[PDB]
């Protein structure tokens, strides 16, 4: 009836997609064995005899953790057909997962997807998350959504991939795999968010009382997010949002599609016990610099798109109010050209939380996806970088001996610096 | 009379190790030549 | 009666996640003790 | 998952590569027979990248050991895991080292090479997934300095994609125990600069100094050395053994670590070390094994890092541990002595996780790095090879094997040329 | 939160830093082994201040235990408390002390700070908010004299913001143990006037008359002497490891007690002291612990504050007691002694109040003052020292070690300049 299609890559994606299809399964009630003790068409497609299948496609040039998860409990639910491993890595190196090993594999998973979009007859759109820091995650994701392009047309490719945080990095080599990933998508992708690290390990030790955290809270909080998205579609609701109305509101034009995220109330689970949790209190702590899982201050640039959706014991007179509220928040700037830039969704049903987990359960929560002119803070930081590396020409060898030309490494840097320009441009006011 | 075969040493020539490696070979030759003429289930002999 | 939605929610899953984070801090202290005292096992073989 | 060929070259290595053995069948759990007797599933899970399966329920490591004189060999084979090795592996001649780099190279090392050729061939094609190849070998003496190269040259010849890691017993700048030495270091020089992919450098002063600084051990011999070094042997493929939140093999390391070409020399730490009374007074922390890592004592390296600076720095950690505090202690670290990092390259650190820790140990990290301070190693030997070649006494021993005088000139300028190249890089 | 760390240099520190250690790990209830056993779970609210953890549940205190003979460290191992102390802390020399303040300086101190400074650096990176270091030492010999003046100023250049505060013992005016001891404590005054904050001063003299007069100690041994100084210790840092009315750390009282920025060396005093079999007669209550803290007989220092004029001072209390009692025994004695009090400083006595009292004692208190009383004590050394420096070729002894006589005209007219600022301010 409505269907949507997930790809992962990379490590990032594939634990980030661990932790999604556990809430689902969960929120669902779906048992590791496939079995049950609705919505389900959406995510996971009946072969009759009470069985379920995951509409997900992992795919990694390492076999390791494809493996790990082979072995893992969810093993009996998902298809060995589905879970795509290769043979080695592309070792953090953008130019031997695009060109030496990635097009190795590139026909074999396309057919896979083709091969499950047969079944989803209500197809409206895929979801792809990127590991930006690893050679797999932009080598590989590059080529796939290149062939994505022009193997299925007008179809939502929505993304949400995990861009460098502005200090904490993992790979010296950073710069240059995100920069040339940033000049890929920025023509083919539909709509990503971004997220990193930085911001999500402060607000999970600031806000979420876990005083040593890991990357398990940092995906389960990621899926939350990506859960109550979808949310809409999957329950019935005053206000249902399609993935099209998100494509219509939350971008005013083609390349200025980069959106913010935030998510309302993270809390621990005694911490909620003792407060009122009204839509007033969710509503204002969105709009907190704090609350941003990107480690840019808004305050710094401008606001001209914001979509609410509710998942929650809500009712439309309270979100009217929490509005208009905000509009009077002289902290708060909006562009003249944009005298609305909100809508606002109704789902009824509450999030689900995970035994063991951390998020105390939020009887009525909301959720923010945002697109400001802060973003371009972060843009810059990486270009400065970026040109520390080239200036001295740092770590080119390695890169044009596995097919990159030189001439890609000025083309991507200018067109950076283009999407820049025309960040400030559209900031301004005339 | 493997284990012992094992405990030898590479380049030796002398006819006390010579002669031990020799007896050695030959000793199993005739173990497993005994083994595989006993290893049928059925053995019709007239003892002594 | 929205209130039933508040009093359904709250009660269960928190006041169990408050009992299981409290009964994984009980495997944990002891987890780590017997970390230690097959650490301290290791130093006694080690010295030897 | 990837498998990978050990191959031990000299007195040096094959006494190395026999600890290096006990460790990895130790965490294994691999009987000393063969048979597989351990108390974990995971053990088992990747055990096909060094070992090999027989049809009898047995595992065999795809180990090559190479010398020239059966003395070693002998004594390796006697060993409590002796048995282990396969009787063919075992190659060697019949003749002395001789001390002498050039009667190695050509006299015994063209009979040799062939031989090993067909025997390293039959463990190469053996199985599919292969990474690169794993030398040790010393270049003081005869067999390792000069063979050891030859055989790297067949390697990188038949195989170009494969990594060809090696690792290196530098001569002994103050403490070493050879007159020829000079000349065998400055020839081995040259042919390992442009066919080593990666090179780390051990001395058996640092060793030394590492085990009577930290461990207090009051007799020493190899066997506590090779201890040592054995550690940072299982701790670089640690992430292809065995799961971990951030995966990262050789090829990760070569990628980060090396800027240029040329520059690709590493130095090698491990932590934590403690004596075997003061145990019970540490607290098992990342910052604990931070402040051991990055501590210039417990380099086994004969070279001072706050001499030079850094432009490239790794670490990997085995353990069920967080993220968050590997981010904190490396950023923080990266931050507080920024004067030793280079301006013009931002995160000069690299981290990796792998989940299962070595035996009897919570928390343990080994630290590849690579500094401007391998400029003194090189520039000893260079000044003391200079001494020799002015007067040139010891060179008729080697031009007796037909050996030209050429390839003194050739390998100091070489050294010379590597030296400046290295001098550049200080701004 | 408010750490600590912890320093001993030479003979006489390392004897009272163990009994300092003795008493606090009794308070907080450490058992010899190193394993906590005590009663109170106010006892580890706040142990982080003096104690680390080490993995097994057992503390170890942040101590550095500096000397240049090993026979001191032959004596705190085999102490009853020993064990509890880092082996690796425990940094020694190999060479007599010399009983000279210039070879501790010169010689010996080059070799040895760099290990300290590292050994030091340690523990300063184990805490969160290290308030200050704690150093004990005495002015006599030179080991502690003059190596401790090194480490001092040392510490001050890679601190400058931590609170350094010193308990020093100077030599005895009647009871000197050394041929050569003014040169020694003329030298040490200089860098002890400019470096430390905080210093307070304690003579054997006047410990000695303290034991006989109230104690009552037919036979007293240091032991006994160094009881009373490790209560002083235990005293001053109570606010920190336990609640009360009124905290009051040493920054605070750094604060008050330090009009200008040289006038900071105090004389510091304890009460309750009774005779082992008079105590049945003493109701001890607030007015009768005010009583004794203000007697001159209790002040450990030998000079009479009563000919001079009193600075500002601070009281600390511990136990339970009313406010308003302790507030009035102040006023009371500040106005009934108005004569030993300057004018313009009116409020001359702090207080400050600790809920938890020591072991044995329902209630206890320290008092902590500044008066130009200290120029008594300066006048019998420059006295001394000037007779001394008359014959000019005793200082030979000294040259030897590379003191140029010029220092010692220097250091005294410091000290002299100390002296007449004292004097200015006595009006
Ligand atoms: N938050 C979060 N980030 C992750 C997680 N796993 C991986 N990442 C991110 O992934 C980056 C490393 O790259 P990989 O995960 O190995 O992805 P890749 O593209 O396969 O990289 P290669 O192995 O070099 O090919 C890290 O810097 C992390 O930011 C996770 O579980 N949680
Ligand atoms: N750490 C360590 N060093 C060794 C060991 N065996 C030998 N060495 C040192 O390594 C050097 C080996 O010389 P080598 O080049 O192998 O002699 P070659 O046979 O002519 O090649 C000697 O100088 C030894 O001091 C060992 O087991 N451990
Ligand atoms: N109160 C006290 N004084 C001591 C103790 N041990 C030594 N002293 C005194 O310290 C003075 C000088 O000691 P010394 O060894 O020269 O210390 P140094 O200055 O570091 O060399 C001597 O006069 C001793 O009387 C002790 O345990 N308690
Ligand atoms: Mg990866």
Known sequence: ?430 | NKKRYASLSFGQDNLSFRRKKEEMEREAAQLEADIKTFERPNVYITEN | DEVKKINSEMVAAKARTFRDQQLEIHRQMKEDEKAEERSIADMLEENR | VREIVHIQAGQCGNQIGAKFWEVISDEHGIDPTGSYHGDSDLQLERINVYYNEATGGKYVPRAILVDLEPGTMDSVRAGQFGQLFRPDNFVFGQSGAGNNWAKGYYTEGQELCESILDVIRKEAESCDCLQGFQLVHSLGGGTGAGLGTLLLNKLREEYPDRILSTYSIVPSPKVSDTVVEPYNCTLSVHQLVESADEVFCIDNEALYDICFRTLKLTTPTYGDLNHLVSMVMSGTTCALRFPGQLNSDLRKLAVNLVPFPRLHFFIVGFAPLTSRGSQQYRALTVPELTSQLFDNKNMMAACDPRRGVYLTASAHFRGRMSSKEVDEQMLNIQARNTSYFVEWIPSNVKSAICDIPPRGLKMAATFIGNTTAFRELFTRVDSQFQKMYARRAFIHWYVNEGLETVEFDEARSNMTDLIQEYEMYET
């Open chain 1, 1 to 430: 009836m409505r269907e949507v299609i997930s790809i992962h890559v990379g490590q990032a994606g594939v634990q980030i997609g661990n932790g999604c299809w556990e809430l689902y399964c969960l929120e669902h009630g779906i048992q590791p064995d496939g079995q049950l003790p609705d919505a389900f068409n959406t995510f996971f497609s009946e072969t009759g005899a009470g069985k379920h299948v995951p509409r997900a496609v992992f795919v990694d040039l390492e076999p390791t953790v494809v493996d790990e998860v082979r072995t893992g409990t969810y093993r009996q639910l998902f298809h060995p057909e589905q879970l795509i491993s290769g043979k080695e890595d592309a070792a953090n190196n953008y130019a031997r997962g695009h060109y030496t090993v990635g097009k190795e594999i590139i026909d074999l998973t396309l057919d896979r997807i083709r091969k499950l979009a047969d079944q989803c007859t209500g197809l409206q759109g895929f979801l792809i998350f990127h590991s930006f820091g690893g050679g797999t995650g932009a080598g590989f994701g590059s080529l796939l959504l290149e062939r994505l392009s022009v193997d299925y047309g007008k179809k939502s490719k929505l993304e949400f991939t995990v861009y460098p945080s502005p200090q904490v990095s993992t790979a010296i080599v950073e710069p240059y795999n995100s920069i040339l990933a940033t000049h890929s998508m920025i023509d083919h992708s539909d709509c990503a968010f971004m997220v990193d690290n930085e911001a999500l390990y402060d607000l999970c030790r600031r806000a979420l009382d876990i005083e040593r955290p890991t990357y398990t809270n940092l995906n389960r909080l990621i899926g939350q997010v990506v859960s109550s998205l979808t949310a809409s579609l999957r329950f019935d609701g005053a206000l249902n949002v399609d993935f099209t109305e998100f494509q219509t509101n939350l971008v005013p034009y083609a390349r200025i599609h980069f959106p913010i995220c935030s998510y309302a109330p993270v809390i621990s689970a005694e911490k909620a016990y003792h407060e009122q949790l009204s839509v007033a209190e969710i509503t204002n702590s969105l709009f907190e610099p704090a609350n941003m899982m990107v480690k840019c201050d808004p305050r710094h640039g401008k606001y001209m798109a914001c979509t609410l959706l509710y998942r929650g014991d809500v009712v439309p007179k309270d979100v009217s109010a929490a509005v208009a509220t905000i509009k009077t928040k002289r902290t708060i700037q909006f562009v003249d050209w944009c005298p609305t830039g909100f809508k606002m969704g109704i789902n009824y049903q509450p999030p689900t939380v995970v035994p063991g987990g951390d998020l105390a359960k939020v009887q009525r929560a909301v959720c923010m996806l945002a697109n400001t002119t802060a973003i371009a803070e972060a843009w810059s930081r990486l270009d400065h970088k970026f040109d520390l590396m080239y200036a001295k020409r740092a770590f080119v060898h390695w890169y044009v001996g596995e097919g990159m030309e030189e001439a890609e490494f000025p083309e991507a840097r200018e067109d950076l610096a283009l999407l820049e320009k025309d960040y400030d441009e559209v900031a301004a006011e005339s």
